[PDB]
Specification:
The structure is a homotetramer of 349-residue chains. By secondary structure, the first copy, chain A, is α/β, with parallel strands linked by helices. The first copy, chain A, has helices at residues 5-15, 18-25, 32-39, 87-98, 112-118, 132-144, 163-167, 207-216, 229-237, 263-270, 283-291, 301-333, and strands spanning 44-46, 61-63, 66-68, 72-74, 102-104, 123-127, 149-153, 220-226, 242-245, 274-276, 297-299, 346-348. A six-stranded parallel β-sheet of chain A has the order 5-6-7-8-9-10. The first copy, chain A, has a two-stranded antiparallel sheet with strand order 1-12. A two-stranded antiparallel ribbon of chain A has the order 2-3. The longest helix of chain A has 33 residues, at 301-333. The first copy, chain A, is globular. The structure holds flavin mononucleotide (FMN) (4 copies). Chains A, B, C, D: It holds the Pfam family FMN_dh.
C-alpha cells in the first residue's frame, strides 16, 4: 500500500531505527511549526474551471529560465547516507531520471566532485558557511565540476533546538562522515581555522558577505531560508537571481511563519523567481504554491521517506506519484498547462 | 433506531461488505473534502420568525418550472446495483412515490429504456461523455423514451484518486454491467471507438462541445459539477437552462470548495435555476441551501444509505424522514411556505 | 464535591434513571445547539477595572421595575415532578427563599392555584396555547390567584426532534399528569376541543393572537422564545412589556442561533427589558449577559440539576453557589453594583 | 530529560504530593483561563530577518532604568516553602546568580528582613493590603532593609474560586507560617485589627489608597494585576513608575483576558515601563512579549517547577535553559541585541 507520500513515511518509520526516524521527522521544540507547515495549506481551496479541454496536459516548466520536466526539485538535506546507503547518489539519480534538479548539501556524505562524476543530471550545490576560506574552496570545487546553480542557506546561524534528538542523545551515526570537509590542511599558522570544526556556522555572514559570495559565483545564485518579501527583495537587490522561501521544514524556529504566508507578496515585490519548500506532501500543496506564483517547490522529507523506505527505487516511486498527483490536479481544476496556474484557481478560506 | 440519515448509514455499513461500503462512503485522498462538505453548513444558523401562523405548511415547489412535492431529487449515482438488487429501479420508484425526480446515471445497471418502461415518474438522464457518437446515441435514446431533462456532469475529466479503493483493490463487482453501453457495434472501420472502452472519459469536452450537446437536446438542459458563479453564468450563456453546483460529494478533488461557498453568488449572477448537491444529510442543510437561493438539492449518499440498508423501502423511509425534517424546520423558523425562504432566516457564523 | 452546577449535573445523572436523565439533558438532533449555547460565552472575556472599592457589593436589581435579590429567575420547565416529588413546589420555594421569581409551566405537575396556595413568593405563569378557550381559562386562573406576570412561550409551534427520547421510546412517566388541564368539560357540542388533547400546540398563534392575549392579561406580559431584535421590537410594539430571548435550551431547533448573538441588538432596538436564557451554567455566563444589557437571566437545567439531585435543598444549594459566583465575579471585575454592569467590562474574542 | 520548562513541570508533578501539585498548577473554575494564557501566544509568529550578523548577541537590558542580565524576573509567589525547604531563599539566590531581580511575596515563608540578610541580589517586595497599618509596617520594613522596588498586587480583592483546592480540601501545610505577619501586637484598644487575620484582603483599596501608598514609598513603585491600558495609564497618572499587566496566572478570574491582549496598547498609551506575566513557558513567548514592547516578563510557575523538582539547583537550571532559549531565539530571528526587538519581527496570525 504505497499510494502517497504518507504511505512512504509509514514504511520509512518501520525500517529506520527510532533515533534516525526521530532525527528525520523531528522539528524544533513543540513541533507547532511542522504542524503549522501542514495546516497552512488548508487556507486555500480549489475553484476549478469546468468545460476546459484537458486532454493534453503539460507539467513542463522553466526554473531560473531552464526547462525541466516539472516544477519540482529534490532539495538539500544533509546526512542522506544515514537514511540509505549512498543516499545522495540515489536521490540525485532518481531526480535525474525524473528530469528535475537535485541539490547537494554541504553536509552530504558523498563529495561534490564524486557525485558530479557519477551523475549527469542538473546538479545544484547548497552552501553552509562555517569558515569563509573553506566555503570558497567548496564553491570553486562545485564551479569546476559543473554544478549549475549555487544555493546559500541562511537559516542555521545557530542550531535548532530539536528535543527529540536531545532525548535520544542523537549521535551522528559512525559511518557517516562530512565528505566535503575531508582532507583539509593543518598548518601551524599558514591555519587554525581548524578551530572552525564545531557544530556551529558563521553567525556573522551578512549582506556584505553575500556580495562577496555573489562576486565569487558566476552562475545562478539563490538565497534559501527567507521568510519575508523584504528580505527576498534585498537578496535580489544584492545580486541574487532568485530566492527560496523556507523555514527549514520546521526544524529551526518552532514559531516561524510558514513561507506560504509571504509567497504572493514576495512574488509581487521581487519580480524574480521565488522558489519555496517546507510542508509540501500532497500534489495539491504544490499546485496551491505554484498558483500563488512560486517558480518551483523543493521537496525535503517527502523524497527522504522514499529513500529511507526503498532507496533509489523508493525515490523514483515518490516522484512518479507526485508527478501523477500534480497532473491529475491540473486536469481536475481545468488548467492543462502548469505554467498557466494563477490565484484564480484558488479560494481563500 | 432509524430516525435520521446517519442511522441509515450505520445500518448500511453493517449490511454492505467493507469494500463496497468504502467505495460508497469514500472520498478523494485525505477526505478533507467530504469533511468540509459537512462542516460548511455550520457557517449558518437560524434566526426564526416567531408568531407566524405555520398551521398550514407547503413544501411544494417548481423546479425548472415544473411543480413537484418538495425541492429534492435523487441524484445520479452509478453502479446502484452493487448496493441493492435492481438498485436503480428501487431508487426511481421511491422518488416517484415521493413525488420527486430521479436521475439515471450513464453508468447505471438498468438501461435507459428499461427504467422508463418500468417507472412512470419524472425521469432525468445524467450524461458522461466518453465517446461523442456513443453519447449521441444515449441522448437520443433518453429523448425517445420520455426522459424530461438532460444533465451533463463535467467533473470527471479524469478519475478521482480515492485511496480506500486503491487499498482494497476495489474491483467493480462481477454481476454489475454497464447496461447503457451494451450491444454496441464492432465494425473494422465503419469503428474502433471500441478503443474508448477504458475507465477514462473525454477530457476534451469543452464549451464548444456543450453547444453541440445543446443543439442535440430539445428539453431542459443542466450542467453538473460547477464550482464558480463564472462557470455557472457561462453555462447559461451557452444555452443551459440551469446548473448543479457540485464537487461530486468530495470524491473527485479533495481540496475543492464546497458548492455552498458560491451558491448565493451563482444565484445572483445567473438569474437562472441553481440546483446543488454535496454534503447534504440533515433537513437543516437543505433549508439553508434553499434559503440561499438554491432551486433544489440533489441527494447522493443519503438515499443510497436507505437503498443499501433496506432497498426500496429504505429509500422511501429516508425520503419521508427528510420530508418531515424539512417540514418541521419550516415550522420552527416560521416560513410556512418553502418558496418563501430567503437569506433573512439565516445568520452567518 | 458539590461546588458548581456541573457537579450537580453529575450527581443528577447518577440519581435519575437514564431515560429521565436523557429527557432532561437532551437537545434537538445532533445537539450542536446545546454545545453552541455553551461555546458562545467564550466569545467574551473580562477586562476588570482595578483599584475599585468593592468592599460593599450589591446584586439587588429591578426586573420589570420590581426589586429582587439578584437578576436571576427559575424559568418554566414542564414535568418537574418527573425529576423530584412535588418538583414544582421545591423549585418555587427555593426561588422564594432566594428572593427571586419562579415561573410555573403550563405543563406543570402542580396546578396554578395549588402552588399559589402553598407558596408566597413572586409567581409567574408560562403559557402554551393549545386551545384558545382553554388558554383563556388558565390565564384567568393565574390572574385570580395572584400570579404577577404572564409569559407566552412561542417556540414550540411544533415539537422538537429530540433523538435521545426517540431512541429511548421516552414515555412520560405514569404518575405525572398535566394538572392544569385537569377536569375540563365534555359537552357534545356546547365542545370537541377535546380533539385538542394531542401533543401539538396551536401552530397558528400569531401577532393578532398576541393582541388578544394582551387585552386579556392586565399585568406585565413577556414573550419568550425570540431570536431576533426585529421580533423583540415587534413584540413591544404589540404591547408586550418585555421579552425573553431564547432557543429553549437547544431543545427545539438544533441550528438556532444562541440568544446571546442578538442580545445587545435587542436591548438597543427595543428600549425595553430584555431577559434571556439558554446555556447559562457559570456566574460568568450570567455576568456577561447582564453586561450586554440583559435585564435578567432565567435558569433552566442548572436549577433542575439541583432538584433532580437533592430536591428543594439541592435547588437552594445551586442558587447560593450561583449567587456567590456572581458576587465573586463582580468583585473580581471591579463592578460592586450589579446594576452598573456595561459592555465596558468585556472584550470580544 | 530536563530540556525545557515542561520537563521540569513533569518532574515536579512526580515529587510533589498531589494536593500541593494541584494547588500550584491549578487555576480558577474551568481553567479555560490558564489554557487561554498559553494559547494566546500562538496568535503571533516570527518573521526573522536573514543575513544579519548575530555572532555577538546581548540579552542585557534596563528594567525601570536599571541594567540586568536579561529582561526576566522571578515574580512574587506565596508559600514557596511548601514547594521546597526555604523556597524563598532558593529562588532569590538562583535569581541573583542569574543577574535578575527576585520579588518576595507578602505571604512568603521567609521574612522580609531575613531574606535581605541572606541574599545580596536585587530584592523587590510585593505587597498585599489586608490592614492598612500592617501594610505600612511591612513597607517600611522593606524600605529599611534595602528592597529596591515596591509592587502592589491588586487582583485579589477576593479569593479566586479554585476548584482543585476545594475538592482536595487543601489546607495550607502545617509547617508553613506567614512570617511577615509574625509577632504583631495584641492591645485591647490601643487594636483589634487582629480581626483582620482572615483569608480576605482589603477589598476597599482604591485609587485614593494608591496615592497614600505612593507617598509612603520613595523608590520605584509598580502596580500589578492590571488588564487594560486605561487602568495602566491611570496608575501612571497617580504616580506609579510602571505596571505589571497580569491575570495572576489564571488563578483569579477564569474568563479574564490574557495580559498579552492589551500589551501593545498599554505600551503606546502609558509611555512608561510595562512589565507582564501569566502564561510564559517558552523563550518564544517571552520574545513575543518583549517585541510587543514589554519591559520585562515575570516568571511564575516556570521557576516554581524548577524549585519543586530540584530546589535551588532546579531554579538555576530553569533560568539557564530560558536564557539560552531566549538567546537562541534572538539569533534565529536576526535581532542580536534584545533591546532592538520590535513588532517588526512578528506576524499576527
Ligand atoms: C533530515 C533533514 C536534513 C536537512 N539538511 C539540510 C542541509 O544540509 N542544508 C539545507 O539547506 N537544508 C537542509 N534541510 C532543510 C531542507 O532543505 C528543506 O528546507 C526542508 O526539509 C523542507 O521541508 P519539508 O521537510 O517539510 O519538505 C534538511 C531537512 C531535513 C528534514
Ligand atoms: C457511489 C457514488 C456513485 C456516483 N455516481 C455518479 C454518476 O454516475 N454520475 C454523476 O454525475 N454523479 C455521480 N455521483 C455524484 C452524485 O451525483 C452527487 O454529486 C454526490 O454524491 C453528492 O454528494 P453527497 O454524496 O454528499 O450527497 C456519485 C456519488 C457516489 C457517492
Ligand atoms: C426538561 C425541560 C423542560 C422544559 N419545559 C418548558 C415548558 O414547559 N415551557 C417553556 O416555556 N420552556 C420550557 N423549557 C425551556 C426553558 O424555559 C428554558 O428556555 C431552557 O431550559 C433554558 O436553557 P438551559 O436549559 O441551558 O438553561 C424546558 C427545558 C428543559 C430542559
Ligand atoms: C502557587 C502560586 C502562588 C502565587 N502567589 C502570589 C503572591 O503571593 N503575590 C502575587 O502578587 N502573585 C502571586 N502569584 C501570581 C504570580 O505573581 C504570577 O502573576 C503568575 O503566576 C504568573 O503566571 P504563570 O504562573 O503562568 O507564570 C502566585 C502564583 C502561583 C502559581
Amino acid at each position: 500500500n504505497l499510494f502517497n507520500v504518507e504511505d512512504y513515511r509509514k514504511l520509512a518509520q518501520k525500517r529506520l531505527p527510532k533515533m534516525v526516524y526521530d532525527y528525520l521527522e523531528g522539528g524544533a521544540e513543540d513541533e507547532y511549526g511542522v504542524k503549522h507547515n501542514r495546516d497552512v495549506f488548508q487556507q486555500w481551496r480549489f475553484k476549478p474551471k469546468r468545460l476546459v479541454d484537458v486532454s493534453r496536459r503539460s507539467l513542463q516548466a522553466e526554473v531560473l529560465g531552464k526547462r525541466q520536466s516539472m516544477p519540482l526539485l529534490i532539495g538539500p538535506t544533509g546526512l542522506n547516507g544515514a537514511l540509505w546507503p549512498k543516499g545522495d547518489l540515489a536521490l540525485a539519480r532518481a531526480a535525474t531520471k525524473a528530469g528535475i534538479p537535485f541539490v547537494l548539501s554541504t553536509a552530504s556524505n558523498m563529495s561534490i566532485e564524486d557525485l558530479a562524476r557519477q551523475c549527469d543530471g542538473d546538479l545544484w550545490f547548497q552552501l553552509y558557511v562555517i569558515h569563509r576560506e573553506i566555503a570558497q574552496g567548496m564553491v570553486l570545487k562545485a564551479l569546476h565540476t559543473g554544478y549549475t546553480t549555487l544555493v546559500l542557506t541562511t537559516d542555521v546561524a545557530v542550531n535548532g533546538y530539536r528535543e527529540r534528538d536531545l532525548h535520544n542523545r542523537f549521535k551522528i551515526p559512525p559511518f557517516l562522515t562530512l565528505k566535503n570537509f575531508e582532507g583539509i590542511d593543518l598548518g601551524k599558522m599558514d591555519e587554525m581555522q581548524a578551530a572552525l570544526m564545531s557544530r556551529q556556522m558563521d553567525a556573522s555572514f551578512n549582506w556584505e558577505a553575500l556580495r562577496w559570495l555573489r562576486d565569487l559565483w558566476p552562475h545562478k545564485l539563490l538565497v534559501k531560508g527567507l521568510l519575508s518579501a523584504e528580505d527576498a527583495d534585498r537578496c535580489i537587490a544584492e545580486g541574487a537571481d532568485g530566492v527560496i522561501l523556507s523555514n527549514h521544514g520546521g526544524r529551526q524556529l518552532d514559531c516561524a511563519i510558514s513561507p506560504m504566508e509571504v509567497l504572493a507578496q514576495s512574488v509581487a515585490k521581487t519580480g524574480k523567481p521565488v522558489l519555496i519548500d517546507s510542508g509540501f506532501r500532497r500534489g495539491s500543496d504544490i499546485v496551491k504554491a505554484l498558483a500563488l506564483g512560486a517558480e518551483a517547490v523543493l521537496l525535503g522529507r517527502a523524497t527522504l521517506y522514499g529513500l529511507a523506505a526503498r532507496g533509489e527505487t523508493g525515490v523514483d516511486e515518490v516522484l512518479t506519484l507526485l508527478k501523477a498527483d500534480i497532473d491529475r490536479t491540473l486536469a481536475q481544476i481545468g488548467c492543462p498547462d502548469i505554467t498557466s496556474l494563477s490565484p484564480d484557481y484558488l479560494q481563500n478560506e
